[PDB]
Every structure is written in C-alpha cells, then in structure tokens.
Amino acid sequence: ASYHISNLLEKMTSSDKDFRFMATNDLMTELQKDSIKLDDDSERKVVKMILKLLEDKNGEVQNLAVKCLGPLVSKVKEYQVETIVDTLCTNMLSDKEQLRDISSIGLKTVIGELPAANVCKKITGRLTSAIAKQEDVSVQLEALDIMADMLSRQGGLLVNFHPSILTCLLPQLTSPRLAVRKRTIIAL
Amino acid sequence: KKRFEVKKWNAVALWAWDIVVDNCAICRNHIMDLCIECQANQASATSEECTVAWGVCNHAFHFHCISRWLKTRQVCPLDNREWEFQKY
Amino acid sequence: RKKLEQLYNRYKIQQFCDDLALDPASISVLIIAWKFRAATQCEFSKQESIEKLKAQIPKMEQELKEPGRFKDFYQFTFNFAKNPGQKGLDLEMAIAYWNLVLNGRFKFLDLWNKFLLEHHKRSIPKDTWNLLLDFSTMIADDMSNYDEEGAWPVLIDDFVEFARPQI
Ligand SMILES: [Zn+2]
Ligand SMILES: [Zn+2]
Ligand SMILES: [Zn+2]
C-alpha cells in the first residue's frame, strides 16, 4: 500500500546503516515479486531515493542499490528509464572514481536486464562522444567496455548508428596504450 | 673477519594515530589487553573475542566498546563522522 | 503485633535459625531468603510469633513446590546466589545449587552433574539456567523427542548427544 512505501521512504533517511540496509532490501524484494499498484509519484520518489543512495558513504548500501536497480527497470514508465540513463551518463563523466565505477556497474546491469530501443540509441549517442580521443583514459576504457557489452548483448537494432560507431572506433586503433587497442579490437 | 657494505635498503612502515593506538579512547586500558567489562567477567565465551576493531579513519577501538558506542550514537568519537568497519 | 519487632533487634550462623535447629547448608535458609527477597547471601537490612516462624516451614515448603511459584523461586535463585560483580555463576557454586535445589525433581541430575567437569571448564550463563528447568520438564526417558535445531543452547544439545549412546 501507499503507507508501506511512505514509511520505507521515510526510514531510508534514518542515518543508521542497519535501517538503510533493511528498507532497501525490502524494497528490492517487493519490486522483484510483482509490485502492486505503484503510483507514478511512488516511482518518482523510488528512483530519486535509489539514485541518492548510489552516492552513500557505505559500500553495502551502494551495492544493494546497484543490485536493486536491475529489477526496478523491469516495470517503470519509459521516462523514468530515460532520466535514469541520463543521470548515469552524466555521473560517468564525474571526477570521482567511485561515482564512475558505480555508474558503469549500474549501466551494465541495466543493459543486461534489457532484452528498449531509444534507451540504447541514447546510450550509444553518449558513448560515441565519450570514446572520442580525449585526455581521460579511464573514461575511454569504461565507455569501450560498455559499448562492447551492449553490442554483445544485442546487435539487431542500431542499424543506422553503425557508421558512427565505426568512425569513432577506427582512430582508437593507433592509441599508445595497448589495452585501448585490444578493447577497440574486441568492440570492432 | 670480513668487510660488508650496503648499497640500498627498502623498508615498509605503517602509520597510525598516536593518540589512540597506545590506549583506546573509550577505555584507558591497553589496546592489547582485555576491555573493562571483559576483565570483571573472565570465565565466559565473550572474553575470548575481545579484539581490535579498525575503521576507515584508521582509528583503533575495542570491538565491544565500539559496538556499545554504536548502539545509541553513530559517529566515531575522535573524528566526529560516520564509522565504518574495515578490519578486525 | 508486639514483641516480634524486637526479634530482629536482638538478632542484629545457625544461631540465627535456632527456632527449628536449622543449618546454613539447607534448602530452608535460601527459601526464607527468597521470601525475604535478599539481593545476595547474608544480605539483610532494617526494612525486613516464634511459633508462627516454627510452623512456617511445613506450609510454605508444601506451597513452594507447586508449579508457577517454584518458577519464580528458581529465577530468583540465580540473582540471590550470584555476586553483584560477575554476570556468570562459578562452576562449583552452580553444581552445589543444582544438587541442593533440583534434588529428585530432575530425572538425570546425577548424570547431568558429572558432565561439564572434564569438558566444560567455564562458567554457566544465565540463559542455560533458565531453560534447564523447561528441558527437565519436557524430557522423557527415551530422549527421542529432543531436537538439535531448536531453541536450546549449545550446551544442552551437546549434553544430549553425549548422553544418548549410553542409554
Ligand atoms: Zn573486551
Ligand atoms: Zn575499549
Ligand atoms: Zn574516526
């Protein structure tokens, strides 16, 4: 009911780790088993709460939120999926390494969960500029890994975006780092 | 009777706060010694687990003392921020 | 009403219980202490007929052995016989009180007493004492109804496992 969701959301900010871990586990196990009559405002609060918890200072809560992100996207309106993808993409470019790793893991989990078309198009549009020859080697590595995983999972779609992917991947073959060369070879 | 000379030396050292490494902040007993409540009772199964607990801020506290402190307060006593267990 | 209040004053050791030739190593002294809600041994204060005291023993011995009140007495014995400075009762003292209090009521008191001597050389916690009486009440001769995955302490189940082959 709405009361249970409200109390879980309220207790998710109890400043105590045990309370923060139990409520998130309850939310995850409720979403995993046929969540009933979740009003749009409840989706909004749940998405915002999970995104904020992804920045928590304890590893256990962040890991549980990352795992919960998967079953969440199974039943939500497409707009929340788009804004979650956008938030993960902009957090991937953050200077903090923990945020980059968390966003990459969340995006990989989302890609693995997804069997839907516009999400992949937006992700590819972001990664095309991400992989470009810039001064951040780690960002290039993460974007290459994400695109390789996305291509391995599904390749039937993105018919019109393949030339752009090839055009961005080709200059990476002469990068001084051999790991970049191997990763772009795998992506090709 | 021989002559030996050293060309180079490599050493590894560990750093910790000197205020609390010698003795716990909660209890003034030695860090390697048993806690205050583990000394009066010395014939129980809880006296064979009193070890050192470390955190992110490299603060060393007795496991029982920090567990009792984290029952009504959720901050590390010396740095005044959220405490997270790192090693035992 | 009168002349009874001065008994404590003149009292203020077997001489304390000369009304019935009682002995300190007996059930009745600790039963009376439980009736007087003494915190520990030989703990008396000013807050608390001779024929009435003499006749008290038959009746409240008869009444205490009934269930319910005996549960409260058994619970109070732990705090009465324990020093305030330690949460765990000593092994020898616990064995002595097991002999004194559970005389005959426990089916396997003699066998249970020989245990935790060459194996469990540690103090007894409060939870085992509380559940020992329930275990004795529920136990049977064959000991086939016991469960190893229940709500019993790790001492009771290991004692059951040790005593199972010998019967
Ligand atoms: Zn201790
Ligand atoms: Zn301590
Ligand atoms: Zn600290």
Side-chain angles (χ1 to χ4, degrees), chain B residues 57 59 61 76-81 83:
Chain B
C57 53
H59 285 132
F61 297 118
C76 173
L78 309 182
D79 67 2
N80 224 284
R81 71 188 185 91
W83 167 273

Side-chain angles (χ1 to χ4, degrees), chain B residues 40-45 48, chain C residues 85-88 122-124:
Chain B
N41 321 48
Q42 217 153 340
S44 211
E48 338 173 338
Chain C
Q86 186 169 7
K87 198 195 161 55
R122 305 184 187 179
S123 183
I124 261 53

Side-chain angles (χ1 to χ4, degrees), chain B residues 24 26-27 35-36 61-62 65 68:
Chain B
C24 182
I26 277 67
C27 69
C35 76
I36 39 179
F61 297 118
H62 286 113
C65 295
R68 290 202 298 283

Side-chain angles (χ1 to χ4, degrees), chain C residues 15-64:
Chain C
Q15 193 270 326
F16 272 129
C17 53
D18 277 336
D19 292 331
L20 291 161
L22 197 53
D23 183 274
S26 67
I27 309 162
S28 180
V29 285
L30 46 89
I31 299 280
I32 289 281
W34 159 86
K35 182 59 73 77
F36 282 149
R37 55 178 183 281
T40 182
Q41 286 185 353
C42 71
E43 194 273 329
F44 281 82
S45 288
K46 277 81 72 173
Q47 51 196 4
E48 73 269 12
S49 284
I50 54 181
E51 275 79 24
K52 182 63 68 176
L53 200 143
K54 277 201 289 291
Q56 269 296 316
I57 276 188
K59 56 209 44 153
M60 61 74 252
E61 261 203 7
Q62 189 264 331
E63 206 279 302
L64 183 133

Side-chain angles (χ1 to χ4, degrees), chain C residues 105-167:
Chain C
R105 175 165 25 256
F106 194 15
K107 279 80 175 176
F108 310 144
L109 182 51
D110 201 355
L111 168 60
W112 165 244
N113 239 336
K114 294 184 287 293
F115 195 45
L116 49 82
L117 278 168
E118 83 282 15
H119 290 161
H120 174 244
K121 40 172 174 297
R122 305 184 187 179
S123 183
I124 261 53
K126 179 183 219 195
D127 181 65
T128 56
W129 171 284
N130 291 312
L131 287 168
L132 204 69
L133 186 44
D134 292 357
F135 176 60
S136 65
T137 278
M138 152 267 175
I139 202 61
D141 288 350
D142 50 6
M143 212 144 39
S144 299
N145 55 343
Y146 190 76
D147 48 352
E148 198 80 2
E149 323 303 303
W152 300 109
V154 200
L155 194 80
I156 292 179
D157 59 41
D158 75 36
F159 165 66
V160 163
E161 193 273 331
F162 174 53
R164 212 155 75 162
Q166 60 96 24
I167 47 165

